[PDB]
Design a protein around this ligand. Structure first.
Ligand SMILES: *CC(=O)NCc1ccc(Cl)s1
Length: 225
């Protein structure tokens, strides 16, 4: 369990910020709304790894939602081709993502899914797939991202440098794009060391979340309500 941990009680993360007034206050408040947490390795891939695991976990045993998700995943090679990715270069990553979706369907256990996400090779193939899909989705909708995010940004250069490469960290744009690309509704909780309210953002704005993540000291950890 070196990439995604076993489930722990929410208050177990007090030991990560010992004798810290503001972190202690915010973690106590968080414990009033959430029961449990999984920690992820801080290797620069933890947003993609956390969202991929938490969303597939939320599908286990749900036969309609699995069918619909599989239907969407089968179309994603068209998104990649439209953005100029070549099939022989994305094949290995697509195949690994499709395989873990079939595992959710066929096997249906938390244990089996957690083993795939802690297998360095399978887990990193999954993350690289999610990164290419994020890049395709932004590139195919460049005017949308320029209109609503930043009219001055260079979309192609941003995708080449800050989305595609392993270990590149995320901002709002990558989170919005991957949420939209896979139709995942997610809520991010923010815990920083400023004397401010514990607060959250939902992607997209009006939705009921499938997935809750905690963003703290640059990691995304997985929360359970
Ligand atoms: C999400 C993720 O992998 N974060 C990487 C980190 C950078 C600084 C940290 Cl401390 S963790």
């Amino acid at each position: 369990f070196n990439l995604i941990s076993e489930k722990c009680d929410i208050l177990s993360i007090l030991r990560d910020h010992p004798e810290n007034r503001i972190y202690r206050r915010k973690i106590e408040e968080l414990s009033k709304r959430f029961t449990a947490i999984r920690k992820t390795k801080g290797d620069r891939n933890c947003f993609y790894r956390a969202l991929g695991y938490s969303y597939l976990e939320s599908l286990l045993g749900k036969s309609r939602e699995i069918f619909k998700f599989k239907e969407r995943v089968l179309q994603t090679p068209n998104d990649l081709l439209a953005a100029g990715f070549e099939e022989h270069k994305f094949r290995n990553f697509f195949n690994a993502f499709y395989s873990v979706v079939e595992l959710v369907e066929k096997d249906g256990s938390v244990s089996s899914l957690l083993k795939v996400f802690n297998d360095q090779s399978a887990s990193d193939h999954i993350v690289q797939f999610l990164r290419l899909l994020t890049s395709a989705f932004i590139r195919n909708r460049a005017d949308f991202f320029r209109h609503f995010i930043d009219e001055e940004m260079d979309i192609k250069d941003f995708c080449t440098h800050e989305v595609e490469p392993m270990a590149t960290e995320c901002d709002h744009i990558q989170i919005t794009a991957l949420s939209q690309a896979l139709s995942i509704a997610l809520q991010v909780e923010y815990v920083d060391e400023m004397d401010t309210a514990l607060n959250h953002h939902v992607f997209p704005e009006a939705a009921t979340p499938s997935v809750y993540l905690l963003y703290k000291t640059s990691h995304y950890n997985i929360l359970y309500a």
